[PDB]
Write a protein that binds this ligand. Structure first.
Ligand SMILES: Nc1ccn([C@@H]2O[C@H](COP(=O)(O)O)[C@@H](O)[C@H]2O)c(=O)n1
Ligand SMILES: Nc1ccn([C@@H]2O[C@H](COP(=O)(O)O)[C@@H](O)[C@H]2O)c(=O)n1
Ligand SMILES: Nc1ccn([C@@H]2O[C@H](COP(=O)(O)O)[C@@H](O)[C@H]2O)c(=O)n1
Ligand SMILES: C[C@@]1(CO)OP(=O)(O)OP(=O)(O)OC[C@H]1O
Ligand SMILES: C[C@@]1(CO)OP(=O)(O)OP(=O)(O)OC[C@H]1O
Ligand SMILES: C[C@@]1(CO)OP(=O)(O)OP(=O)(O)OC[C@H]1O
Ligand SMILES: [Mn+2]
Ligand SMILES: [Mn+2]
Ligand SMILES: [Mn+2]
Lengths: 156, 156, 156
């Protein structure tokens, strides 16, 4: 009986590789972020965290209080999940939506699903990921950055 | 126990008429798309499809594999729905949110609801549609395109 | 068994103070709107209203039909809620997501939660609020306006 929503973006810049949903995808530009700018996992975390009312992943700091920072989005997701289960919550299902003009996400979706399903400890049927463009409109339309929205559903 | 989320946009261009939620709305510009750029139904489909974990409407191709393409958003929605029920899923409720500076959506909402309620086979009380502008900000603020977000809830 | 989604934005302009989630936050610019441009509550209302299928807060008019207009977002939220309960609906949980480059929302979240929890009559554990930026991208990236997304979950 708990719904959750997350949103997140990151601007392009830097050298090559970008990481999304935990997968390393080839691309001319890279993603600027304090950590691996995995917008997919950040949005997913915020969603999960939002449903359990623990307030975004930002509560997990950019203060790098000797514990969390210097850690990829995957570790933060597992950590946040560990705290959510602590409040006796169990995963119902999650849906992620990546918004980018490029690169093509479709081929990497399955592997993303494998990762998320591992970190949240569940089967892949409980996690869905899709991608969409903004038809060359917006900061996404241009290759300025990538955005991602995620909804989550937890059970008690 | 299944939540779903969808997002979708389309840029303006072309002659007159635009189609949204299945309704033909008068407007100076038109919507550029491979098929009738019905952002409302596409977002709705992705949402429904996301909850049943079948990965966006794009999995239904733009490869036009002799079967699906040359078909309006309404047919795709009914098809996707047919496949979702196949996995023993039944509709709970859906909410659509259209983001456009113009034209005015409010008057066409009721008819949109009729269409969606037909295609998904349910009563109108299980489908809600609303509209909002971006106060002349963004590619939506300008008359560059229309975007739409949709959430869905399926039951087993 | 009812999900709901809301979205809303407002452009900057005017003198000082902005109101978000019912809290008065210090800021160089202000928010242009027919009423206190509380994007957080508007998105929240639309969400709640969407789940009960009553079609956005705009159905509550900008026609100022002697009843509603000249009223802050807080009164509209309580009113909309009063009508939702009328249809025998009860609150399950809600999650809000504020998208702004500035000002910093994090410190005001707790108080926002207090307000929402009062207006909807429930405990704070049933209401979550978070904030995020667009890394200086988009009309939000620039200080052009503030946007906000909200999901809601109602029970019968
Ligand atoms: N307007 C904003 C935007 C983001 N934030 C906060 O800063 C943190 C990280 O924001 P970003 O994800 O945008 O970098 C979060 O904890 C969030 O609550 C804020 O307090 N006010
Ligand atoms: N960055 C992106 C954006 C869209 N896509 C894919 O292309 C298809 C259609 O995208 P559009 O709706 O943006 O036209 C979808 O199946 C989607 O998964 C992608 O693989 N990578
Ligand atoms: N394209 C649009 C955008 C908003 N609207 C309507 O106008 C009202 C308020 O819109 P804003 O929140 O964007 O100011 C709502 O009731 C909404 O349904 C519309 O009818 N068509
Ligand atoms: C650790 C954080 C904050 O520094 O990494 P970030 O790269 O900056 O990404 P962010 O979008 O800001 O989301 C919050 C955190 O993941
Ligand atoms: C058939 C598709 C893909 O060609 O039609 P499109 O018009 O292109 O619209 P789209 O947003 O890309 O959503 C996917 C499909 O509906
Ligand atoms: C009363 C309304 C409509 O005038 O106030 P607004 O300030 O204009 O804000 P809005 O975004 O348009 O949301 C609808 C209503 O809250
Ligand atoms: Mn991020
Ligand atoms: Mn589309
Ligand atoms: Mn508003």
């Amino acid at each position: 009986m708990r719904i959750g929503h997350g949103f997140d973006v990151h601007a392009f810049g830097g050298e090559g590789p970008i990481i999304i949903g935990g997968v390393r995808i080839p691309y001319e530009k890279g993603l600027l972020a304090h950590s691996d700018g995995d917008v997919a996992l950040h949005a997913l975390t915020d969603a999960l965290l939002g449903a359990a009312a623990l307030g975004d992943i930002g509560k997990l700091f950019p203060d790098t209080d000797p514990a969390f920072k210097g850690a990829d989005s995957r570790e933060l997701l597992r950590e946040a999940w560990r705290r959510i289960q602590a409040k006796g919550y169990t995963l119902g299902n999650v849906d992620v939506t990546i918004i980018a003009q490029a690169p093509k996400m479709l081929p990497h979706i399955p592997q993303m699903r494998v990762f998320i399903a591992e970190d949240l400890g569940c089967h892949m049927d409980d996690v869905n990921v899709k991608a969409t463009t903004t038809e060359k409109l917006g900061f996404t339309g241009r290759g300025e950055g990538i955005a991602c929205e995620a909804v989550a559903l937890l059970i008690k």
